[PDB]
Structures are given as structure tokens and as C-alpha cells.
Amino acid sequence: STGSATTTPIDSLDDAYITPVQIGTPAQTLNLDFDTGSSDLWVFSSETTASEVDGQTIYTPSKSTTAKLLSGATWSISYGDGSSSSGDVYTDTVSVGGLTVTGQAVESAKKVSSSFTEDSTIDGLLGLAFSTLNTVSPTQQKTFFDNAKASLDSPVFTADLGYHAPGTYNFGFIDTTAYTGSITYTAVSTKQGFWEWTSTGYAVGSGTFKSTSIDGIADTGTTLLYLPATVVSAYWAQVSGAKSSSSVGGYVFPCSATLPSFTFGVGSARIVIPGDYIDFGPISTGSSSCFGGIQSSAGIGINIFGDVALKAAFVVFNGATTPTLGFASK
Numbered sequence: 001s002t003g004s005a006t007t008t009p010i011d012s013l014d015d016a017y018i019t020p021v022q023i024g025t026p027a028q029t030l031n032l033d034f035d036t037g038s039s040d041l042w043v044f045s046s047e048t049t050a051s052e053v054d055g056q057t058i059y060t061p062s063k064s065t066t067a068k069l070l071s072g073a074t075w076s077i078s079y080g081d082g083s084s085s086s087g088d089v090y091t092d093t094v095s096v097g098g099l100t101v102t103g104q105a106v107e108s109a110k111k112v113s114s115s116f117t118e119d120s121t122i123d124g125l126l127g128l129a130f131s132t133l134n135t136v137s138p139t140q141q142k143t144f145f146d147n148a149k150a151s152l153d154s155p156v157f158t159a160d161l162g163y164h165a166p167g168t169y170n171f172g173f174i175d176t177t178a179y180t181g182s183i184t185y186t187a188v189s190t191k192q193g194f195w196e197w198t199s200t201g202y203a204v205g206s207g208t209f210k211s212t213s214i215d216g217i218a219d220t221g222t223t224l225l226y227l228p229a230t231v232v233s234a235y236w237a238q239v240s241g242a243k244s245s246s247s248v249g250g251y252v253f254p255c256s257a258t259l260p261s262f263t264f265g266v267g268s269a270r271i272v273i274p275g276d277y278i279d280f281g282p283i284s285t286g287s288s289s290c291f292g293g294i295q296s297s298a299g300i301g302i303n304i305f306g307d308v309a310l311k312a313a314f315v316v317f318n319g320a321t322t323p324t325l326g327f328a329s330k
């Protein structure tokens, strides 16, 4: 089997991407944030505290003839921004782009934090990291990909995120028309539960490439590119007027600037992030100070190749017995 679904930015800044997902019988379609940095599939639901729902589409398990309460199971998760959610668990039929999994754990939110409430466009998350990170207790549950894998034509999924435009998540096949040149594959460590890999270096604009190992995660659920302070300082030093602002919480730059590109290495290959991809717009409405899309990972504890980086590539998440990651230009 295979599946193919369009993913769409939630706003004009590409702050996140949503992908329609069919849950239950008859289908209830929710728009979920596909997140290769976590491993829970959770949804706003009929059980979510009413004051914490503001415009989201909810899953109502009582209206699904295939829903079954997973007795005794609960879940609770936090995210990199400090947002969180928790609840109980059903199993139900879940389909993404024509690919169906029966008995998928669907984690129903009883509580969500304010940042989820405030985002009317995201009805929940669909985790695509390794199932070892799944938070269901007392019996850990498998991700959608992990459940689908044995049925797939090939044990892979691909992320093809758009810049200010829709893109695609494919399951079970590599669309050879979706990228240019060749796909360069690189080793993955699953030891921390993430798609963790090592970039071979970077360049700023038309500058020379610096060969240096940068260990980080391929994370579709993170908006920006978080890299070591040395690398980030080198980037922003090429933008007149750019500075790190403690009050704003990162690097900002004059909105009148033309940003340089940023290149990262994947083995001997190079992915070029155009400068425009690094502009996240005014820090507040009407401001001439703009927020940068490359930020320091110091204090996070890990480097994160988020959407800013991933959207510049066609990315293969290879879930073979020994997982790997593939990157191609597009």
C-alpha cells in the first residue's frame, strides 16, 4: 500500500503545516500537524475541556462505530515551546491520503495548554518519530507509520514541505518526479527516539563551506532552524543591523534587509536554503524589526533541522531495519 496527502501552511509565515487525516467510521476529518519530532497522535475531542476549545474541529469517539476505549490508558506530553496536552486513549481506524491503519491509538485530549487553544487551525498532532517516545501509559503505543510499515510498498515516508505553498507527505514510496538530482542518504541514530543525524557543515550566502559535524534532528514539528551559536552568529553577521535580542528572544533583523542563503551539508551534498525562507516577518504587527528563521540552539540541548531547513529539500524518512535519512534538492 501507499498514501499521499497534501500538507498546507497554517499561515502566511509557514509557522506550521496541517494535513487532513480521516479518523473513525464514518470518517471524521481533522487537520493534524505531522511531527517527526514526537510520537503521539493526539486530537482535540468531545472530551476536551470546553473552555480550551476555540475553533478546532473535534473527534467525537461516540460517533465512530470503530472506536474502542483503550481501557486504563492515559497520555501526557510537552513540546519544545513549553506547550502541553493530556488525556485518554481510543483505538480507531485512521487514514492518511488513502493509506489506512486499523487499531491506531488515537489519543483524545482532555486538557490542552493555551497555545493549542489559541491556534484554531491545528486539530492535533500526528507523531512520526520513533515509537519509543510515545507517552501512552501503562502500555506504550505505536505511531501511524510504525503500524502502517509492514503494509507499505517500501518502509518509508517522505516530507516535501512548501515555502509559502502546499506540499506533500507520501507513505510507502519515493516520488522520483518530486526532486532534482539525486537523494543523498545519511546515517540516523535512534538512541534518543528522534530522526537524529549529522550534517557535514555549512555555508553562509556565497561564502566558503565550513566542514564541521553538526548533530541534530529532522523535525517537521519545529518551525525554525536551530543551530550552534557559532554558526548562527556567523550567519547573522552577514546581515546589516541584525542582533540577538533577549527581550524578543532571538535574532532579529531590519525588515528592509535582503537575507543571504544558508547551505547545510548532507554527506558530500549541499542543500541551499534561500534567504527569503529565513524571514519570519515583523516581531509584532507594524514593526520594522523582523524575526530570524535561524536561531541558536544553545540552551535547547540539541540542534533542530526544523521546517526552515526541511522545506528546502525533499526528505526521505527511511524506516528500514536500520533507519536512514535522505535529502535531495528540489
Ligand SMILES: N=C(N)SCc1ccc(Cl)cc1
Residues within 6 Å of the ligand: 035, 036, 037, 038, 079, 080, 219, 221, 222, 300, 301, 302
Ligand atoms: N517536535 C517536537 N515535538 S519537540 C522537538 C524537540 C525540541 C527540543 C528538544 Cl530538547 C528535543 C526535541
